[model samples]
Target: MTVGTYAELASVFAALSDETRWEILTELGRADQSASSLATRLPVSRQAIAKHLNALQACGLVESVKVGREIRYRALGAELNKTARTLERIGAEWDRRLAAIKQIAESME
Candidate 1:
């Protein structure tokens, strides 16, 4: 599997580093929600939520579309899944390298 470089992985993980942003992702994953609605559910103010939403959008984890007077946001499942797979691949590679190191150390005189 193709794995992203450290910088790319860092950016993706950084996007998910915030608890509020992660909450937005979880909420959007369940269903589309307007910024106002999300603000009501979350502790942050609507403007603050909008800022986090924008960050998530830049990360490609969330998308928004205007519906009537409201802009609704939803999780970008495909992009998120792709990132998850990439991270999993990275972890698998690290596991392989660690196992090899263990074997080499065990056989050392």
Candidate 2:
């Protein structure tokens, strides 16, 4: 998809809203890892890590891929980039509207 395309912004932000989830995302961003491994690395339990992984997956933030005999999770960088671009588009639109309003105000004088 192009940069102008919208992403699931609310869901993405929701997925990252948790402090634990943010830590999980940071770990996954470094390299793919299983829930068990994540538990060992982080202060969370395996079950909790798995739950966070599922939440991330639901928002298209993290994805599971089989690595040999283990199921590993990886952070989806493209999805985050897509969200950033969407925000940029929103900012640009607001600037455009504000400029239009300024033009109208100036014309009234």
Candidate 3:
């Protein structure tokens, strides 16, 4: 993976580090929702959900659109999918390195 500066990946990971943000992202994944609607459905306070929603928005995991008086949020699945792909590549590389190390260790024994 051509991960440059690591800033973009780091920002995304940071945003997703919080459980509340992950929950909010998944909520949007299920259906588009306004802040008030999410507030009602989740056990969290409206303010906390709003903050998490903002973090998700900045993380590019969610997008907001104006729907009349309230703003509606929707999950950006493509962004999450891309992140998943990058992680897969990283994991595969690590697995290969570990396998190589195992082979060398076995040969020495």
**Best candidate according to TM-score:** 3
Residue pairs in candidate 1 whose N, alpha carbon or C atoms collide under 3 angstroms? none
lDDT of 2 by residue, 78-109 (tens): 87897788778789989999999999999995
lDDT of 2: 0.85
Total clashing pairs for each candidate = 0, 0, 0
The digit string of per-residue lDDT tens for model 3 on 1-109 reads 5558266778788888888787778888898999988888778898898888878887788899886887899988877787888889888999999999999999994
Candidate 1 accuracy as lDDT? 0.84
In model 2, pairs of residues that clash are: none
For candidate 3, what is the TM-score? Answer: 0.85
Off by over 4 Å in 1: 1-4
Q: How do the residues 42-70 of candidate 1 rate in per-residue lDDT, one tens digit apiece?
A: 89898889888888888788889787988
- TM-score of candidate 2 on Cα atoms, chains taken together: 0.80
What stretches of model 2 exceed 4 Å from their correct place? 1-8
* Candidates 1 and 3, the one with greater TM-score: 3
Error of 2 at 69 (Å): 3.1
The 10-residue segment with the lowest total lDDT in model 3 = 1-10
TM-scores of all models?
A: 0.83, 0.80, 0.85
lDDT of each: 0.84, 0.85, 0.84
